[PDB]
């Protein structure tokens, strides 16, 4: 995020980091329950990647994080990689997350819920802060 | 890249107005947000765009794509979760 600010630690408890086996963060995701993470299809997750929950500072060794293995990747069959439309994948975890003060689920909308133009929302992540 | 988790608030746009920036690249399963002085950027993909509804944070978008330079005056594009939630529910129920 360019021109954002640091979050309060633990205040976005559904936010996960997707890391490869070298420990490199490549994408975010959101916990929707103890067994399932929603992410983007174009992230290209495999079952060799890791879901990290409960993290704030990726440079700290002292946080009580959860490193969760992925059992199966469900890329939406309507995903179109040429247009990047329907850009969603579900990850079923092999190991359930343990919910706590710092790890918990985001709500999903109903299909008919309305979010009007001009509403102020929030996004979070460990993406670049400057290009 | 940052070590510590970042946040930003930003407004939702309509698809019709988002098309002034992105043209026919905007499809019905996309929602645009931003152009407000902040931008999602590389490495944010897959993460949440959440809006508060009835006191609870709700997943409205999934960070997807946008400007190759993460311009803060151009809207970011997010997967529109209302268009996708029936597939989510079908998948959880079968697995």
């Amino acid at each position: 995020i360019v021109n954002g600010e640091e979050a309060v630690p633990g205040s976005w408890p559904w936010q996960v980091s997707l890391q490869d086996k070298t420990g490199f963060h490549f994408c975010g995701g959101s916990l929707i329950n103890e067994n399932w993470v929603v992410t983007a299809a174009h992230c290209g997750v495999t079952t060799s990647d890791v879901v990290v929950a409960g993290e704030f500072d990726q440079g700290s060794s002292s946080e009580k994080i959860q490193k969760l293995k992925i059992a199966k990747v469900f890329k939406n069959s309507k995903y179109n990689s040429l247009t990047i439309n329907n850009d969603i994948t579900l990850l079923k975890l092999s190991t359930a997350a343990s919910f706590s003060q710092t790890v918990s689920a985001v709500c999903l909308p109903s299909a008919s819920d309305d979010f009007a133009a001009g509403t102020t929302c929030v996004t979070t992540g460990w993406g670049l802060t400057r290009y | 890249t940052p070590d510590r988790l970042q946040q930003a608030s930003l407004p939702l746009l309509s698809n019709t107005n988002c098309k002034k920036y992105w043209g026919t690249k905007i499809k019905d399963a996309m929602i645009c947000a931003g152009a407000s002085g902040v931008s999602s950027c590389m490495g944010d993909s897959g993460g949440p765009l959440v809006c508060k509804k009835n006191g609870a944070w709700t997943l409205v978008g999934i960070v997807s794509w946008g400007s190759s330079t993460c311009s803060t005056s151009t809207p970011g594009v997010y997967a529109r979760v209302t268009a996708l939630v029936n597939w989510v529910q079908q998948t959880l129920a079968a697995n």
Binding site: - | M42, S64, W65, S68, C70
Partner: peptide, 4 residues
Amino acid sequence: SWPW
């Protein structure tokens, strides 16, 4: 553009 670019995947984020």
